[PDB]
Amino acid sequence: TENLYFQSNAMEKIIVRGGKQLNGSVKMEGAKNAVLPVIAATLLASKGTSVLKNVPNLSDVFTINEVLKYLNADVSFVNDEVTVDATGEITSDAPFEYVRKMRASIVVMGPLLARTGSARVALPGGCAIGSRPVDLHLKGFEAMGAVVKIENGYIEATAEKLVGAKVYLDFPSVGATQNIMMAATLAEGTTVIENVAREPEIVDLANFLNQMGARVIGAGTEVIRIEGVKELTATEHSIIPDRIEAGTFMIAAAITGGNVLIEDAVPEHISSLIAKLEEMGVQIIEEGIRVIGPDKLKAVDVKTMPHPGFPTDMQSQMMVIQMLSEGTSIMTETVFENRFMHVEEMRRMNADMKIEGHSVIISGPAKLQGAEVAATDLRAAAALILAGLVADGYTQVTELKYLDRGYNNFHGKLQALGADVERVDDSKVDVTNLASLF
Amino acid sequence: TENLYFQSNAMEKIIVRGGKQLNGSVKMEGAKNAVLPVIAATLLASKGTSVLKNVPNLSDVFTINEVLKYLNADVSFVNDEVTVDATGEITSDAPFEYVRKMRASIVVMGPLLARTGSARVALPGGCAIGSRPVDLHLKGFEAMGAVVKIENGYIEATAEKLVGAKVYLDFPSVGATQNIMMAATLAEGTTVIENVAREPEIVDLANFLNQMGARVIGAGTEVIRIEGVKELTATEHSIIPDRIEAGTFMIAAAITGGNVLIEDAVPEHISSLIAKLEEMGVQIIEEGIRVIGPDKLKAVDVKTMPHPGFPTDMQSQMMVIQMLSEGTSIMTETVFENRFMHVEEMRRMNADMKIEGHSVIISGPAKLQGAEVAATDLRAAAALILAGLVADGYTQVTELKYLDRGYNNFHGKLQALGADVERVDDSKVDVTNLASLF
Ligand SMILES: [Cl-]
Ligand SMILES: [Cl-]
């Protein structure tokens, strides 16, 4: 009955034939950015069995589940439901190489530090952006009385007496906010975390800690206060819908002059995006969000900001609609200033863009052309596929491993909206006759 | 007259009382790692009836036999002999759920692709290590003119004209080497497979393909060349002895200061292990391998490597002798970097070890203590039982399903060597009086 994870074949391709208008309905699954921390949080429950629902079928979920089992928790994953029994004696080490491959593994430190007093995790490695330093995580645990360190590819934290403390975050880190908040739940005393991430995933996690008996207030604001308690008890919780996936289909509908109904979407979680699309001429209706694309798109400048500002996860995709707008526009990053590796791939599709500082000058309207493009990361993978919907000809997108890390049956959903999209093995494709497919 | 497979009861236990010196003789059965591919290879024989001897009584053998019968071959298994009549029209589908449970099922793709031109097998699922991706298998078949894919939990391959081709394996995969080599036997033209596995099981399989009329040279070296032929004819073949099982009893004799004669063992197949044990002070004699354990074990570092290097299948067991050595040592994996799930169980027995990267720092000599341990996999199951032989007190090993997947009457053989070991049902055991047993 347990869910099985199936590997995909290397070098598979998503071939898109542009020119089709999207029309229909699309349902969203749970957010990956919300589920990992929620699963990790189950380690805090010394009583009862946790029941998580609306859990997406993604690789990181299976991986995190394996980590928890190794931490001595009984985990089960059937359909979209995960069950966690963490009433036993929980261990504190997650050292395998597979732990490094999953950059989000660090999320178990807070819960372990609070539940067991120690945590050891293998670091993922890396230097540039796409991710940021983990210093804030340690700064927070240190303030709470822990002895910390990064040694031999390992990040560790040990606390004889985890206590409450005032912590100021240099920047609103989602990861740091999550770890510090989770660690605070069982610390002796009160913790005040300033300049925290305000993303919806943080609020959902705060709600979950509260349902388990924690005392966390302020989630969603710039300040979170946690009054530590002796113990937390298991409960049931549903993972919030993926607001980013919602944004991806909104843009797809907007650029194809479509009419799509995005089901199970919370407009409040993507106000910035909505407001920005409306400035371009797109109609957004809260029927449950319906998106109707216009004939022409008005050029508009966009600047990523910590939530509730414009989300960095919609950046690469937003650039697609910017390229099709009537005039020059600019996209700027203030969250991840180096997240523009997809620009060179969009050029192959005839895009006209220039990287300058931490901004990209986009010269629209561009007459996109089909080409062989390689995804550079999760959101970029989807961005290229969106470009394919509007490009003249056939677009072949490779490196699907990135797409699969956050989008389930992405091609199938597009097909259901009337798009000419197919996902095939490399051996099936004969470039001289892509028309054969479809 | 047909052999029957009997289920064992869930939660059975192997209780070991350490302190006994092993002395005597032990006979080895056929290797599981050798028999599955050999059985699958019988599908290539369009003429005659195959007679396989020295076939071990293991679950996977019964399972593979059921698969072949479904592929329309007549199979018979009596005593240690399997007979296969594959002269009929052979089918190409192996889709049942029981096919997924056996991770080795993929071995029938090569033979089917060569014999029928197509193959469809249900994938086992899984993400981390213990097993590796099956991409190499498909890369090879693709190079040979096949259209392949992994879709809906199924791996498939179809070839209008299977032809010879040059194939380079990213890593020396035993599974990939086997499938590609078998597929090449009936392909039109010559196949050159580079960077192949050199394990003894590969050589034995190559010998078998040759006895059937194939033209395969280079097995055992880093390059295998196969000149495809029109048809293969049935023959007789004996499965080579299980070199790993031989290693298990060698270590058992070595750690108990014993004198055991391992009958029907090929020293050439385990040179690395032998050479490594000798560095620790163990005497190994080619009488047919006799092992005499010393009073003290000298500490030594070990690094797993593809054959002829130190075998990964002896890794967990080798760690036991490393723990008892006079000083610190290190065990490193280069084949399966995550194969250290047994470390937490050895700790319960008072072992002192640290997982770092893909290495484990072992602080010996450890004064092992009896405890309740759960096997995590085949080789780990045996490793824990070996630790039990030296531990002070009683060691209870559960999850015997893993042990049974590769060791036949393991407890009986140890008893015959003078060990205080018993395999009982959970209902027979009264923890407050284990002495009662024995
Ligand atoms: Cl990514
Ligand atoms: Cl196993």
Side-chain angles (χ1 to χ4, degrees):
Chain A
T1 187
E2 289 290 339
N3 295 348
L4 297 177
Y5 173 79
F6 300 109
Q7 163 192 152
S8 61
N9 187 22
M11 304 178 183
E12 295 179 0
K13 297 183 177 183
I14 282 184
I15 303 178
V16 182
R17 171 176 172 83
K20 291 296 179 296
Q21 181 184 9
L22 302 179
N23 295 127
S25 181
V26 58
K27 302 178 180 180
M28 303 299 68
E29 295 66 14
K32 182 187 64 177
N33 298 356
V35 61
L36 299 180
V38 173
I39 293 181
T42 63
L43 293 170
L44 296 167
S46 58
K47 296 186 62 177
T49 299
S50 298
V51 176
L52 303 178
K53 298 177 181 179
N54 190 25
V55 175
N57 185 16
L58 298 174
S59 181
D60 289 1
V61 173
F62 293 90
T63 304
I64 195 64
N65 292 347
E66 295 299 327
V67 175
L68 284 56
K69 298 175 185 176
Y70 185 78
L71 295 177
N72 196 30
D74 298 347
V75 182
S76 178
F77 176 50
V78 181
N79 299 164
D80 59 350
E81 175 179 342
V82 172
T83 298
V84 181
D85 176 351
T87 58
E89 181 181 0
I90 303 300
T91 53
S92 306
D93 193 34
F96 309 105
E97 292 294 344
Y98 75 86
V99 173
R100 303 186 185 275
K101 71 179 188 61
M102 188 180 65
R103 303 189 61 86
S105 298
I106 195 176
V107 296
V108 301
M109 297 190 65
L112 293 177
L113 190 59
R115 180 67 189 274
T116 69
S118 64
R120 179 172 182 267
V121 177
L123 291 174
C127 54
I129 285 185
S131 58
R132 303 188 66 176
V134 302
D135 306 40
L136 296 182
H137 294 254
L138 304 185
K139 180 183 180 180
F141 306 134
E142 180 179 4
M144 300 178 61
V147 174
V148 299
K149 65 175 182 177
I150 295 183
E151 176 178 353
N152 299 346
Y154 288 89
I155 186 177
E156 306 182 19
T158 304
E160 297 185 4
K161 181 183 298 181
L162 189 63
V163 294
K166 298 179 59 57
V167 177
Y168 176 86
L169 303 180
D170 296 344
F171 64 94
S173 175
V174 173
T177 296
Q178 295 173 341
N179 272 332
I180 301 179
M181 178 176 57
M182 288 184 292
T185 59
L186 299 176
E188 177 177 342
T190 304
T191 296
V192 179
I193 317 175
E194 298 181 357
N195 192 29
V196 292
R198 301 172 59 183
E199 284 65 9
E201 298 68 22
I202 294 299
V203 172
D204 186 42
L205 179 60
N207 292 343
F208 178 68
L209 301 177
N210 282 314
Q211 296 174 345
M212 287 186 291
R215 302 179 180 183
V216 180
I217 69 177
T221 69
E222 299 183 4
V223 177
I224 289 178
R225 296 179 178 89
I226 304 74
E227 181 178 349
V229 299
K230 299 183 300 300
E231 59 182 352
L232 298 184
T233 304
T235 182
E236 300 187 1
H237 184 89
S238 299
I239 306 303
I240 67 179
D242 186 348
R243 63 187 177 95
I244 306 303
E245 183 183 13
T248 302
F249 291 89
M250 269 167 55
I251 296 181
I255 67 181
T256 59
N259 179 345
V260 178
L261 176 57
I262 302 180
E263 299 180 353
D264 301 345
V266 178
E268 299 66 6
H269 301 165
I270 56 182
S271 302
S272 299
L273 178 57
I274 296 178
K276 209 58 177 179
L277 294 177
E278 293 177 339
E279 300 181 16
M280 303 183 64
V282 178
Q283 299 184 191
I284 307 300
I285 309 303
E286 302 182 10
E287 298 293 353
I289 304 178
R290 179 176 300 276
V291 180
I292 298 181
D295 298 7
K296 298 179 180 179
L297 295 166
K298 183 180 181 180
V300 178
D301 300 350
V302 178
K303 183 179 63 179
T304 64
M305 293 293 294
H307 186 87
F310 191 96
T312 176
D313 292 345
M314 293 301 305
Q315 175 274 123
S316 57
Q317 301 175 24
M318 188 65 181
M319 292 184 58
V320 174
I321 193 177
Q322 284 180 308
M323 281 180 299
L324 301 176
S325 62
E326 179 64 22
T328 301
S329 62
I330 180 179
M331 171 62 75
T332 303
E333 274 284 359
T334 63
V335 183
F336 296 102
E337 297 182 359
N338 295 308
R339 175 157 56 175
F340 301 112
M341 300 302 172
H342 60 272
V343 176
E344 181 62 21
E345 300 297 342
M346 295 182 179
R347 288 170 176 165
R348 293 180 58 88
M349 296 182 59
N350 191 26
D352 190 4
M353 302 177 298
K354 177 181 296 182
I355 301 175
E356 188 175 17
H358 52 95
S359 299
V360 178
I361 310 300
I362 310 177
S363 300
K367 291 62 65 62
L368 298 178
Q369 304 300 346
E372 302 185 17
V373 296
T376 57
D377 63 58
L378 176 54
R379 308 305 172 183
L384 297 175
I385 296 179
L386 295 177
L389 300 175
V390 178
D392 178 4
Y394 302 86
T395 300
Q396 307 182 58
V397 180
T398 57
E399 298 298 341
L400 298 180
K401 62 178 180 180
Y402 297 112
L403 179 61
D404 298 346
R405 308 195 305 187
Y407 294 89
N408 182 13
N409 188 19
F410 185 73
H411 62 282
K413 296 179 179 180
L414 295 171
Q415 295 175 357
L417 297 174
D420 293 346
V421 181
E422 297 294 345
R423 177 167 180 170
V424 298
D425 189 61
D426 187 32
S427 63
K428 174 67 70 62
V429 179
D430 295 1
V431 60
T432 64
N433 187 6
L434 297 180
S436 180
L437 303 175
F438 306 104
Chain B
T1 187
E2 289 290 339
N3 295 348
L4 297 177
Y5 173 79
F6 300 109
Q7 163 192 152
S8 61
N9 187 22
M11 304 178 183
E12 295 179 0
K13 297 183 177 183
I14 282 184
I15 303 178
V16 182
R17 171 176 172 83
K20 291 296 179 296
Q21 181 184 9
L22 302 179
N23 295 127
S25 181
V26 58
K27 302 178 180 180
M28 303 299 68
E29 295 66 14
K32 182 187 64 177
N33 298 356
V35 61
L36 299 180
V38 173
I39 293 181
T42 63
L43 293 170
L44 296 167
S46 58
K47 296 186 62 177
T49 299
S50 298
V51 176
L52 303 178
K53 298 177 181 179
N54 190 25
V55 175
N57 185 16
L58 298 174
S59 181
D60 289 1
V61 173
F62 293 90
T63 304
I64 195 64
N65 292 347
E66 295 299 327
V67 175
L68 284 56
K69 298 175 185 176
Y70 185 78
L71 295 177
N72 196 30
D74 298 347
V75 182
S76 178
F77 176 50
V78 181
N79 299 164
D80 59 350
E81 175 179 342
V82 172
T83 298
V84 181
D85 176 351
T87 58
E89 181 181 0
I90 303 300
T91 53
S92 306
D93 193 34
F96 309 105
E97 292 294 344
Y98 75 86
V99 173
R100 303 186 185 275
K101 71 179 188 61
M102 188 180 65
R103 303 189 61 86
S105 298
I106 195 176
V107 296
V108 301
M109 297 190 65
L112 293 177
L113 190 59
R115 180 67 189 274
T116 69
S118 64
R120 179 172 182 267
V121 177
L123 291 174
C127 54
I129 285 185
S131 58
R132 303 188 66 176
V134 302
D135 306 40
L136 296 182
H137 294 254
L138 304 185
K139 180 183 180 180
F141 306 134
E142 180 179 4
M144 300 178 61
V147 174
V148 299
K149 65 175 182 177
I150 295 183
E151 176 178 353
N152 299 346
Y154 288 89
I155 186 177
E156 306 182 19
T158 304
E160 297 185 4
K161 181 183 298 181
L162 189 63
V163 294
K166 298 179 59 57
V167 177
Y168 176 86
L169 303 180
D170 296 344
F171 64 94
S173 175
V174 173
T177 296
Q178 295 173 341
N179 272 332
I180 301 179
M181 178 176 57
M182 288 184 292
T185 59
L186 299 176
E188 177 177 342
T190 304
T191 296
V192 179
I193 317 175
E194 298 181 357
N195 192 29
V196 292
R198 301 172 59 183
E199 284 65 9
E201 298 68 22
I202 294 299
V203 172
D204 186 42
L205 179 60
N207 292 343
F208 178 68
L209 301 177
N210 282 314
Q211 296 174 345
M212 287 186 291
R215 302 179 180 183
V216 180
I217 69 177
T221 69
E222 299 183 4
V223 177
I224 289 178
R225 296 179 178 89
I226 304 74
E227 181 178 349
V229 299
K230 299 183 300 300
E231 59 182 352
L232 298 184
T233 304
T235 182
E236 300 187 1
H237 184 89
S238 299
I239 306 303
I240 67 179
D242 186 348
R243 63 187 177 95
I244 306 303
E245 183 183 13
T248 302
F249 291 89
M250 269 167 55
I251 296 181
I255 67 181
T256 59
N259 179 345
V260 178
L261 176 57
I262 302 180
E263 299 180 353
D264 301 345
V266 178
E268 299 66 6
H269 301 165
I270 56 182
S271 302
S272 299
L273 178 57
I274 296 178
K276 209 58 177 179
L277 294 177
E278 293 177 339
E279 300 181 16
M280 303 183 64
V282 178
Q283 299 184 191
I284 307 300
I285 309 303
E286 302 182 10
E287 298 293 353
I289 304 178
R290 179 176 300 276
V291 180
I292 298 181
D295 298 7
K296 298 179 180 179
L297 295 166
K298 183 180 181 180
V300 178
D301 300 350
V302 178
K303 183 179 63 179
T304 64
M305 293 293 294
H307 186 87
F310 191 96
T312 176
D313 292 345
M314 293 301 305
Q315 175 274 123
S316 57
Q317 301 175 24
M318 188 65 181
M319 292 184 58
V320 174
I321 193 177
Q322 284 180 308
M323 281 180 299
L324 301 176
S325 62
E326 179 64 22
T328 301
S329 62
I330 180 179
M331 171 62 75
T332 303
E333 274 284 359
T334 63
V335 183
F336 296 102
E337 297 182 359
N338 295 308
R339 175 157 56 175
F340 301 112
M341 300 302 172
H342 60 272
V343 176
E344 181 62 21
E345 300 297 342
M346 295 182 179
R347 288 170 176 165
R348 293 180 58 88
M349 296 182 59
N350 191 26
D352 190 4
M353 302 177 298
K354 177 181 296 182
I355 301 175
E356 188 175 17
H358 52 95
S359 299
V360 178
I361 310 300
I362 310 177
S363 300
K367 291 62 65 62
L368 298 178
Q369 304 300 346
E372 302 185 17
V373 296
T376 57
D377 63 58
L378 176 54
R379 308 305 172 183
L384 297 175
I385 296 179
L386 295 177
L389 300 175
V390 178
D392 178 4
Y394 302 86
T395 300
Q396 307 182 58
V397 180
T398 57
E399 298 298 341
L400 298 180
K401 62 178 180 180
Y402 297 112
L403 179 61
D404 298 346
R405 308 195 305 187
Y407 294 89
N408 182 13
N409 188 19
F410 185 73
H411 62 282
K413 296 179 179 180
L414 295 171
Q415 295 175 357
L417 297 174
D420 293 346
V421 181
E422 297 294 345
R423 177 167 180 170
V424 298
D425 189 61
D426 187 32
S427 63
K428 174 67 70 62
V429 179
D430 295 1
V431 60
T432 64
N433 187 6
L434 297 180
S436 180
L437 303 175
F438 306 104

